[PDB]
């Protein structure tokens, strides 16, 4: 166990991401209908996954910070830069008496380095790679991406792979199929995909 | 007129005059002539001796209680020369600096280092916009346990120069000239010799010659592990010896 | 491990150590100095933790060079020693540095011992580390109070040599640093009773038996 | 006005408009010309050093053109004394940017960080205004090679050809005139740099004792910044020299 | 109002565009003792007039050529207090440097760092600049160095320059006599002559101190050693 | 409810308040744990010319308090020509200090009894390790509060204030009982009285003995 | 390098002297205990890409420290002619790790670089916080020092040929990985010249 | 461990100190010089554990060094004794040890203060503290009669100090006796190669 | 002119060509506007005698504050601007308060006077605050060095005296003290002596109508600074009246 389920499948340009809505405290879902996927901008989307408090607190702060950078340069924040930038932030925060650790995914298209998708570990280890999961699910989601595709197969087949992974979410871990928040993030912005 | 120029900031807040020396610093020297304390310090090989007017104007004052010899280390001593208002403030400041150092270094201070360090503190007073430099001179005596007896003198602004023989006061130029002859034809030193030479040169320049309850002679001898004030008992003995000596 | 001892002559200090700096009993390095070099006339012997020992000597090395240069006269043992004492008491102790301070001063020559928070006193034989006690014995045999420089030299060689035969961690070459009235002699291999990184033969691999699948050359 | 209500920057102007800045602009003109030209494989900076004297120790080749970072260099026109605090400050900012962003620092970002310190000194804190205009030269992958101009006040602009120093008015118009865009190469911008530097300056000879020349050139996708040494400098001067010589009687 | 307030301050700018203050500071150094520094390119020499006249100066722990670190010395002119703080900070900074790299600091990096500090007083208002011009000598990396740092907080590279009393005349002699690359012993001889131009009242039995920086390192020299060079060329 | 293991203790400070005087007896013995290191020890101090302070329990915690009360008293007398400080302000401000130091769980108790008159009233104040201030007819703190104070209470119960003679017989009775029942102390007491001139109480002397129950 | 905590990095380091260079061989793993998300993560870094510091424990302080060391490097190179010595570099990393007294960090610094002023290949490791060790043979270091150190004493003389040294260090690490569980994927080698860093990437698990 | 004792005269005082610091079974330092000085009219004697005792005494060096400067030449004992006691109460956890401060003040000429590890000063005829002195506790007071003259303090102290270290399990190694008066301190050495120990039991 | 009343006192960051700033010389004038405070030193204490200028007879004790209690053995009698009189009282007192805590003993007067004197000169240096402009005396009986009397003037000069008087009739008063004896004799004989000097010096071109206040600090009051009793005051005064006539 680390944290509840996440499954994320990068296509080869597109990245399709899902997290459960289920933000549960005591033994009930408090929220069950809100996205804790954050729009830090339109060209960059960040999706923060972890505990209940660290998700909302770290990203809301990041968002307001993203906008400030935008004014200053007058160009969207650079993707390569965003990948190193998120690593310094999560290490600095990590000591705090209220625990901050994020399993993050940065998705952006930049006109600079290009596209970036970031795998980021719970040991605040930064890597770009294609196939990521959140929780103890990161091992569960990375594994089906290695065998069944060479991680360049269509987003449609990837969705079918995602349905199968979500069936694991009913079996191995506790989460119910009821609601999952699903978004695909590409160059234009975020697209709302069907709930499960 | 006088040194420096009133124009601009240099007495409102401390920013250099045309001379490149602060308006207050050049004025700072003049502050010794205000004081009326004329000192000559002579260096032996057995002691460092300082002789100064104690400035007791009346015996209504107590001769003991009035002083200008201070104990600023564990056996380093000094004498104050110049405006008295400046002089006590410098003494107390030197004392703080002295205690801190003794601890850090862990042993009693070299006379050279102590004079160097006060010289750094006085620059601070010069530089700061609220403050103004000190108008006094501290003449330190002490025996360094390597080199031997050393006599140092610091200037008002915080100038430092090495000295093996020094004088300061109103009649600074005259006192240093009488002592300069004596340094050239250097006698061999002992407790008595060194003291006799210091007093004699100061008594030629003034041309009065001292009373045995109106001067304060301060020594750091090898026999004392303390800073010692000669008092009226000792001084009286050297004074009757002077008339007869030559 | 890290086993340094020093002994006292009128000039000031003859420092002796064995070589090989150890992480427990395993070598980080097979042959290197444990007695450390501070500026000139001031030297530092080392015991307990190696790492903690290096930073304590090195901080004094800077303060001493400072005090000697401003004053324009000798270095003082009591000076480094007290400067260390005040920082570590404020810290609340974390030292694992047994240092043997030794300097030639303006008046008497002054020898010191630094435990974690310091002690301000003048010893006459100091040994540092967990093997401090084991170092003292050879000295207790071949040194009586106050000897000559040549005799003092022999006692340093002798304290290193008794530890070499009997200990397995006493291992290797004896390094001596003679620091006296104004000179610093760093006699490396005073006696090598064992050779540093010995080899009689070695076995190395044969042309490319090593795993590879990509190579690039960045400039 | 009829009297300034300045004599400190802890008290302010009798109009609320700061005279000291106009005197600062005049100060760049007193000091020698600084010019930056753009290239299509680099950017180069050419500056006139304070030292013209024959006796130079020459341990430094950087005494007005300082390389700050692994992506950017700047130059000074104005008082040399002012650069020394600034140059060490710029090193801190420049590496500070890398730590968070780890990107080839853009010229617009470094300049805005510095402008914060210059605007505060003029407003309060009792610190005298600056008298240097600094030219920042650098490379980013999002617009290319860039040149920026910073003023004593905190006033900034992105250029691709700009000159200040030895009458600014003349110099910026001239640097522009001779500049061409998309026709350039590093060797020819450098030969040209000496030529323009010669005209604004009173000297019709110019040497590497008088002048110090830097390149910023991008090699294998990374920016290598060097301030050049005297023999290398001389070669760019001699290239120019034949032309200068024909002008003369 | 008038020029008096505006021009003098370093709490706000001079209306001239360059500060009338640093110029004032140079005048101070002119009123100081005469100092010459010459890099031979076999070593560096710093020589100054030191007032003995009867030996009225301790030369056992206080000097005018004074070591910052192992192989760096300084010789100075102008205001005495300003300098003493400057020495103590300079040695402090050097020691931080020796601590970290394990090499005593070279003159060329030191002047630049030292300049940053002196600039702060030339920036700060109510605070006057340091009124010492320093001649820094050194031998590091196998090469001798001589630098000049003026009161403004700037550093300039020189092979030979003059400070103190009649600096204009010193710089003119230096250019004239000096040649690139010379012997350190011939170099002292012209330095004693450089002082002799505007000495004032001329040398007694010894009324100069010289310190040499070479391959083995910077050392101030003893009154006897100093006297031997003075006989050769006064 | 607390009581740290004391090292250097003064066990008992006796106190009964009369009409313009107070009689206090203060233990001579200073136990440093089991060993009685020092007898000579008067724990009653002279702050000023109309105040006195006497404390029992840790003596170290006492010596820290005597200089502090000295600087508080020195600030207050400056304002008049001969003004002297009232008992209540100094004792109450110290109460707030001990309530705070009690919450800090490693600390050592002291309990002091101040007598002063700085008002138009003679004040008898206490600051305790636990803290509180009150008036008392007859008082004893620490080890007195535990065992003699109850004997005193018994007396106080039908006869609100005792006579001079009866307080002396009790004192004599009391010293026997403490040596017998508590450890650290001795019989040895100093008799200290505070009045409008300062505190007077000469050195602690031996008084009546009886560690015999062989006779009982 | 003020890095800390040997679990959640995936670090092992070895440095060996070649004969024209010094080469430093490292794993390229990523872990959180032994749980990862990618093949490669960088642990030896180029501070000018001709002198390198390899920092071993956490990735975060490896990059941060690198850039702060770069702040010192540039000023020194600007101030006095010709790029820093290895002797200067080696003590400068020692000083950075040293400053921490109260509850000191444990980094394992490996400094690898040639003396740039006048040739002198040097490779160095330091224990704990730091105490100086100069090595010239081959040395392996980590909190699991022992695995590298047994092998390090075994193949070299004191200077086998650069090509030969390369192949041997890379191999000592590939076989180590089957012995350990802090190592999987990729072995990264930096042979350090004065104008080229030869980088070899070993196979993936 | 060590033994420290201070004995009263008619208006002078005689101090006793021994050297040794033990680290459990193995004695780490015996070399140690635990009779320092602080002034020429005030002295303190060190004992206890060498690391801890030194810091407190040393904080007292720096405060005590300010007190000599302020005043006219000869230092006050009373100023110095206050800092040491105050140091052991505050820093009881961090610094522990018991210093014996003895010399002359500036108000009299016979003052003995003990700032203890438990903290509390009183002047008395004899007090002993530190390690093995506890054992000879009743014993310092009886063996020498209170306020007896100099020669008699010297016989009593020297024999008794040899016997304290003998009986002391963590004692051992040269007894250093000091008789202090005015500006001049005299120390005598009773060796550790010479017994002078009082009738050892079976 | 040896002083200018506008120019070189515009800021307290000035000096003057003689060597002493004019603000300090004015500060001696401030003390001249008020009456005299005399204090004569015994070897068993110090006794002060200050004349207190009155405008009303509704005044009670703790009015004008001529006598301050610096410590429980240090007394202070002041002269000059009463406004200034309160800050000098604070400066001496705060130094005393820190001293008492830390050192733990009675303050030697030899140290206090130089220590305070530094502080009095320290305001003069600053232009954050103006020089002082009241003059005070410190008189102490201690076992630390005996009875000692110092006078500190607003410049920041500290000197020893067996007899000092500060006022506008300080010159005339000091000479008068020297003719009498009080140097070796007890505080009880001395009190009578402090009163008479005030009446004899008392001029009508240097002072105005006054009520006498005298103060103890010696062995009779057991160290501490108290005001003399009314009964005793009136006998000391009764001699003071007789002695003038």
């Amino acid at each position: 166990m680390e944290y509840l389920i996440g499954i994320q499948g990068p296509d080869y340009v597109l990245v399709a991401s899902d997290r459960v809505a289920a933000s549960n405290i005591v033994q009930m879902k408090d929220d069950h209908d809100k996205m804790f996927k954050m729009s830090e901008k339109i060209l960059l989307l960040c999706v923060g996954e972890a505990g209940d408090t660290v998700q909302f607190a770290e990203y809301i702060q990041k968002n307001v910070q993203l906008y400030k950078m935008r004014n200053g340069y007058e160009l969207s924040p650079t993707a390569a830069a965003n990948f190193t930038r998120r690593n310094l932030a999560d290490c600095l925060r990590s000591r705090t008496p209220y625990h901050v650790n994020l399993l993050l995914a940065g998705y952006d298209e930049h006109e600079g380095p290009a596209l970036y998708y970031m795998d980021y570990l719970a040991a605040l280890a930064k890597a770009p790679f294609a196939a990521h999961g959140y929780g103890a699910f990161l091992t569960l989601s990375i594994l089906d991406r290695y065998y069944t595709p060479t991680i360049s197969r269509e987003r449609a087949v990837e969705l079918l792979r995602k349905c199968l992974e979500e069936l694991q979410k009913r079996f191995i871990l506790n989460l119910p199929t009821f609601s999952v928040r699903v978004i695909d993030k590409d160059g234009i912005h975020n697209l709302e995909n069907i709930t499960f | 007129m006088s040194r420096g120029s009133s124009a601009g900031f240099d007495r409102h807040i401390t920013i250099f005059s045309p001379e490149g020396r602060l308006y207050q610093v050049e004025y700072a020297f003049k502050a010794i002539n205000q004081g009326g304390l004329t000192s000559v310090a002579v260096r032996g090989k057995d002691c460092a001796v300082i002789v100064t007017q104690k400035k007791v104007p009346d015996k209504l004052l107590d001769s003991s209680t009035v002083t200008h010899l201070f104990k600023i280390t564990e056996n380093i001593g000094c004498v104050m020369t110049g405006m008295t208002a400046d002089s006590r403030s410098q003494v107390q400041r030197a004392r703080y600096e002295a205690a801190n150092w003794k601890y850090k270094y862990g042993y009693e201070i070299p006379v050279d280092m102590l004079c160097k360090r006060i010289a750094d503190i006085s620059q601070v007073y010069t530089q700061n916009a609220e403050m103004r430099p000190l108008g006094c001179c501290m003449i330190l005596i002490g025996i360094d346990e390597e080199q031997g007896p050393q006599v140092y003198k610091c200037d008002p602004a915080g100038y430092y120069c090495g000295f093996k023989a020094t004088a300061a006061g109103v009649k600074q130029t005259e006192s240093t000239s009488f002592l300069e002859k004596k340094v050239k034809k250097k006698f061999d030193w002992t407790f008595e010799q060194t003291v006799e030479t210091a007093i004699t040169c100061l008594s030629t320049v003034l041309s009065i010659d001292f009373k045995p309850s109106e001067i304060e002679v301060g020594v750091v001898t090898v026999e004392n592990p303390k800073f010692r004030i000669l008092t009226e008992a000792e001084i009286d003995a050297h004074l009757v010896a002077l008339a007869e000596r030559d | 491990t890290t086993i340094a001892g020093v002994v006292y002559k009128d000039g000031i200090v003859l420092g002796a150590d064995t070589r090989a700096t150890e992480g427990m009993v395993v070598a980080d390095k097979n042959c290197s100095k444990i007695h450390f070099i501070s500026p000139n006339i001031y030297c530092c012997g080392a015991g307990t933790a190696a790492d903690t020992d290096m930073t304590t000597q090195l901080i004094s090395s800077n303060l001493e060079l400072h005090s000697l240069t401003t004053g324009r006269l000798p270095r003082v043992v009591t000076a480094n020693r007290m400067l260390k004492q005040m920082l570590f008491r404020y810290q609340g102790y974390i030292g694992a540095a047994l240092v043997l301070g030794g300097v030639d001063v303006t008046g008497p020559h002054l020898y010191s011992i630094y435990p974690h928070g310091s002690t301000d006193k003048l010893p006459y034989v100091t040994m540092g580390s967990g093997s401090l006690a084991a170092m003292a014995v050879f000295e207790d045999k071949f040194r009586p109070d106050m000897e000559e420089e040549e005799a003092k030299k022999l006692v340093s060689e002798a304290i290193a040599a008794g530890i070499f035969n009997d200990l397995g961690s006493g291992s290797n070459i004896d390094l001596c640093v003679i620091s006296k009235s104004k000179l610093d002699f760093l006699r490396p291999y005073s006696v090598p009773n064992k050779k540093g990184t010995r080899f009689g033969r070695y076995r190395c691999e044969k042309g490319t038996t090593a795993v590879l699948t990509e190579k690039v050359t960045p400039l | 006005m009829s009297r300034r209500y300045d004599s400190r920057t802890t008290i302010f102007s009798p109009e609320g408009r700061l005279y000291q800045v106009e005197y600062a602009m005049e100060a760049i003109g007193h000091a020698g010309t600084c010019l930056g030209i753009l290239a299509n494989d680099g950017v180069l900076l050419a500056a006139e050093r304070r030292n013209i004297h024959k006796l130079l120790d020459e341990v430094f080749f950087s005494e007005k053109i300082y390389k700050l970072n692994e992506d950017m260099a700047c130059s000074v026109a104005g008082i040399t004394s002012d650069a020394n605090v600034l140059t060490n400050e710029l090193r801190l900012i420049a590496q500070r940017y890398l730590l968070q962003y780890q990107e080839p620092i853009p010229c617009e970002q470094l300049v805005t960080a510095l402008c914060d310190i210059k605007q505060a000194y003029t407003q309060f804190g009792g610190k005298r205004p600056f008298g240097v205009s600094l030219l920042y030269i650098g490379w980013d992958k999002h617009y290319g090679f860039q040149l920026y101009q910073s003023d004593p006040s905190g006033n900034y602009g992105g250029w691709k050809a700009t000159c200040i120093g030895n009458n600014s008015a003349a110099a910026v118009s001239m640097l522009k005139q001779d500049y061409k865009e998309g026709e350039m190469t590093l060797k020819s911008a450098l030969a040209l740099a000496v030529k323009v530097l010669n005209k604004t300056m009173d000297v019709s000879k110019l040497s590497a004792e008088k002048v110090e020349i830097a390149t910023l050139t991008r090699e294998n996708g990374k920016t290598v910044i060097r301030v050049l040494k005297q023999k290398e400098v001389e070669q760019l001067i001699k290239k120019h020299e034949e032309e200068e010589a024909k002008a003369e009687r | 109002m008038a020029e008096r307030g505006y021009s003098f301050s370093l709490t706000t700018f001079s209306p001239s565009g360059k500060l009338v203050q640093i110029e004032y500071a140079l005048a101070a150094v002119a009123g100081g003792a005469p100092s010459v520094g010459i890099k031979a390119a076999n070593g560096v020499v710093l020589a100054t007039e030191k007032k003995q006249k009867s030996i009225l100066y301790d030369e056992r722990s206080v000097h005018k050529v004074e070591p910052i670190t192992k192989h760096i010395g300084l010789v100075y002119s102008g205001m005495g207090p300003d300098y003493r703080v400057l020495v103590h900070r300079a040695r402090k900074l050097a020691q931080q440097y020796y601590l970290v790299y394990q090499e005593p600091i070279p003159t060329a990096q030191l002047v630049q760092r030292v300049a940053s500090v002196m600039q702060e007083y030339t920036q700060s208002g109510g605070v006057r600049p340091f009124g010492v011009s320093l001649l820094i000598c050194g031998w590091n990396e196998g090469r001798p160095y001589l630098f000049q740092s003026d009161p403004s907080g700037a550093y300039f590279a020189w092979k030979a320059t003059a400070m103190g009393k009649n600096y204009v005349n010193g710089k003119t002699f230096l250019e004239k006599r000096y040649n690139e690359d010379l012997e350190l012993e011939d170099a002292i001889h012209t330095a004693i002559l450089t002082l002799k131009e505007s000495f004032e009242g001329q040398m007694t039995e010894d009324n100069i101190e010289v310190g040499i920086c070479n391959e083995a390192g910077f050392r101030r020299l003893t009154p006897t050693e100093v006297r031997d060079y003075l006989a050769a060329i006064a | 409810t607390q009581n740290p293991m004391v090292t250097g203790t003064s066990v008992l400070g006796v106190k009964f308040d009369c009409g313009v005087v107070i009689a206090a007896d203060m233990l001579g013995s200073y136990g440093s744990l089991a060993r009685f290191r020092n007898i000579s020890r008067i724990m009653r101090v002279n702050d000023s010319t109309m105040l006195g302070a006497s404390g029992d329990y840790a003596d170290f915690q006492y010596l820290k308090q005597v200089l502090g009360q000295m600087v508080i008293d020195e600030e207050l007398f400056g304002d008049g020509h001969s003004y002297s400080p009232r008992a209540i302000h100094s004792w109450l401000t110290r109460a707030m200090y001990s309530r705070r130091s009690k919450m800090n769980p490693l600390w050592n108790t002291k309990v002091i009894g101040g007598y002063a008159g700085g008002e138009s009233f003679l004040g008898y104040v206490d600051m305790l390790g636990v803290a509180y201030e009150a008036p008392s007819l007859a008082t004893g703190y620490g080890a007195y509060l535990a065992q003699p104070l109850l004997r005193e209470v018994l007396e106080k119960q039908p006869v609100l204030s005792q006579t001079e003679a009866r307080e002396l017989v009790e004192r004599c009775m009391r010293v026997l009982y403490y040596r017998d029942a508590r450890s650290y102390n001795r019989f040895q007491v100093a008799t200290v009285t505070e009045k409008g001139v300062e505190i007077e109480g000469p050195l602690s002397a031996q008084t009546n003995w009886d560690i015999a129950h062989m006779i009982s | 390098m003020s890095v800390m905590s040997y679990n959640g990095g995936a670090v092992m380091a070895m440095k060996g002297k070649n004969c024209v260079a010094i080469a430093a061989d490292r794993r390229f793993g990523i872990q959180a205990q032994m749980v990862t998300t990618d093949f490669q993560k960088i642990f030896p870094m180029g501070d000018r890409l001709y002198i390198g510091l390899a920092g071993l424990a956490t990735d975060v302080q490896t990059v941060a420290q690198r850039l702060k060391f770069r702040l010192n490097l540039y000023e020194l190179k600007e101030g006095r002619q010709i790029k820093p010595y290895t002797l200067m570099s080696m003590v400068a990393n020692l000083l950075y790790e040293k400053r921490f007294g109260p509850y000191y960090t444990e980094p394992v610094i490996a400094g690898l670089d040639p003396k740039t002023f006048k040739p002198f290949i040097c490779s160095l490791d330091l224990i704990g916080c730091p105490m100086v060790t100069d090595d010239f043979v081959v040395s392996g270091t980590c909190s699991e020092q022992m695995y590298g150190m047994c092998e390090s004493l075994w193949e070299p003389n004191m200077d086998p040929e650069h090509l030969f040294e390369t192949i041997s260090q890379a191999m000592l690490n590939a076989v180590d990985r089957d012995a350990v569980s802090g190592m999987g994927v990729i072995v990264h080698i930096i042979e350090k010249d004065k104008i080229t860093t030869r980088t070899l990437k070993a196979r993936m698990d | 461990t060590t033994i420290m004792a201070v004995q009263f005269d008619g208006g002078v005082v005689l101090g006793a100190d021994s050297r040794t610091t033990t680290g459990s079974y193995i004695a780490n330092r015996v070399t140690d010089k635990l009779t320092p000085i602080h002034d020429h009219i005030f002295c303190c004697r060190s004992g206890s554990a060498a690391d801890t005792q030194a810091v407190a005494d040393a904080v007292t060096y720096q405060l005590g060094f300010h007190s000599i400067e302020l005043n006219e030449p000869p230092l006050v004992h009373t100023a110095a004794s206050l800092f040491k006691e105050m140091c052991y109460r505050y820093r009881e956890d961090l610094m522990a040890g018991i210093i014996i401060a003895g010399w002359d003040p500036q108000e009299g000429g016979q003052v003995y203060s003990v700032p203890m590890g438990g903290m509390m000063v009183r002047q008395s005829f004899a007090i002993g503290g530190s390690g093995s002195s506890y054992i000879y506790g009743y014993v310092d007071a009886t063996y020498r009669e209170g306020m007896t003259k100099d020669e008699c303090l010297q016989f009593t102290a020297n024999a008794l100090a040899l016997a304290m270290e003998r009986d002391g399990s963590s004692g051992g190694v040269i007894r250093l006796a000091a008789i202090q008066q005015s500006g001049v301190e005299r120390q005598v050495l009773l060796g550790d190669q010479i017994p002078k120990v009082t009738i050892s039991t079976l | 002119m040896s002083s200018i009343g506008t120019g070189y006192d515009l800021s307290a960051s000035t000096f003057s060509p003689d060597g002493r700033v004019f603000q300090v010389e004015y500060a001696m004038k401030a003390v001249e506007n008020s009456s005299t405070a005399i204090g004569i030193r015994c070897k068993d204490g110090v006794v002060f005698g200050v004349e207190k200028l009155v405008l009303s007879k509704l005044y009670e004790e703790g009015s004008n504050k001529r006598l301050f209690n610096v410590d429980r053995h240090v007394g202070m009698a002041v002269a000059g601007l009463l406004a200034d009189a309160r800050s000098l009282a604070d400066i001496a007192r705060e130094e005393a308060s820190n001293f008492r805590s830390n050192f733990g003993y009675n303050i030697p007067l030899k140290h206090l006077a130089d220590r305070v004197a530094m502080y009095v000169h320290a305001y003069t240096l600053y232009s954050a605050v103006r020089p002082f402009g009241c003059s005070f005396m410190l008189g102490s009986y201690s076992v630390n060095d005996g009875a000692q009397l110092y006078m500190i003037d607003p410049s920041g000069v500290s000197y020893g005296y067996w007899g000092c008087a500060i006022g506008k009739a300080r010159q005339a008063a000091k000479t008068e003290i020297e003719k009498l004896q009080m140097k070796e004799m007890t505080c009880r004989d001395v009190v009578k002596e402090v009163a008479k000097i005030i009446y004899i010096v008392h001029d009508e071109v240097k002072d105005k109508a006054f009520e006498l206040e005298l103060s103890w600090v010696g062995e009779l009051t057991k160290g501490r600074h108290e005001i003399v009793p009314k009964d005793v005051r009136e006998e000391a005064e009764k001699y003071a009246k007789e002695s003038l006539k």
Side-chain angles (χ1 to χ4, degrees), chain C residues 64-129:
Chain C
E64 292 303 294
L65 202 180
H66 199 269
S67 310
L68 158 132
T69 207
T70 300
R72 283 92 68 170
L73 86 167
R75 297 168 173 89
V76 185
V77 87
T78 181
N80 50 83
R81 150 249 282 192
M82 305 270 190
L83 274 168
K84 295 190 275 191
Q85 177 158 50
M86 65 193 326
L87 293 164
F88 280 70
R89 71 175 166 225
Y90 293 135
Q91 287 176 46
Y93 321 158
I94 207 283
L98 277 157
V99 169
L100 307 78
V103 197
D104 181 75
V105 198
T106 66
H109 69 141
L110 298 171
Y111 184 46
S112 187
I113 183 75
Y114 170 78
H116 41 73
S118 206
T119 310
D120 42 282
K121 66 185 170 201
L122 309 190
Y124 61 97
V125 285
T126 54
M127 312 293 151
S129 64

Side-chain angles (χ1 to χ4, degrees), chain B residues 71-74 92 95 102, chain H residues 39-40 58 66 69-70 73:
Chain B
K71 185 167 176 170
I72 60 148
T73 305
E74 195 67 77
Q92 188 60 236
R95 282 166 165 170
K102 199 189 328 167
Chain H
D39 200 86
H40 57 89
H66 165 64
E69 262 66 303
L70 285 177

Side-chain angles (χ1 to χ4, degrees), chain A residues 2 87-88 91 119-129 131-132 138-139 142 146, chain G residues 8-9 30-33 35-42 45 58-61 63-64:
Chain A
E2 292 193 86
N87 185 245
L88 280 289
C91 38
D119 274 51
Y120 190 89
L121 204 39
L124 313 312
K126 59 180 204 297
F129 186 58
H132 169 107
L138 181 152
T139 58
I142 210 168
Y146 288 140
Chain G
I30 155 176
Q31 70 179 352
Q33 181 171 51
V35 197
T36 192
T37 194
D38 190 55
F39 302 74
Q40 305 181 127
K41 198 160 62 179
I42 179 154
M45 294 188 188
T58 39
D59 204 48
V60 324
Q61 301 291 303
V63 83

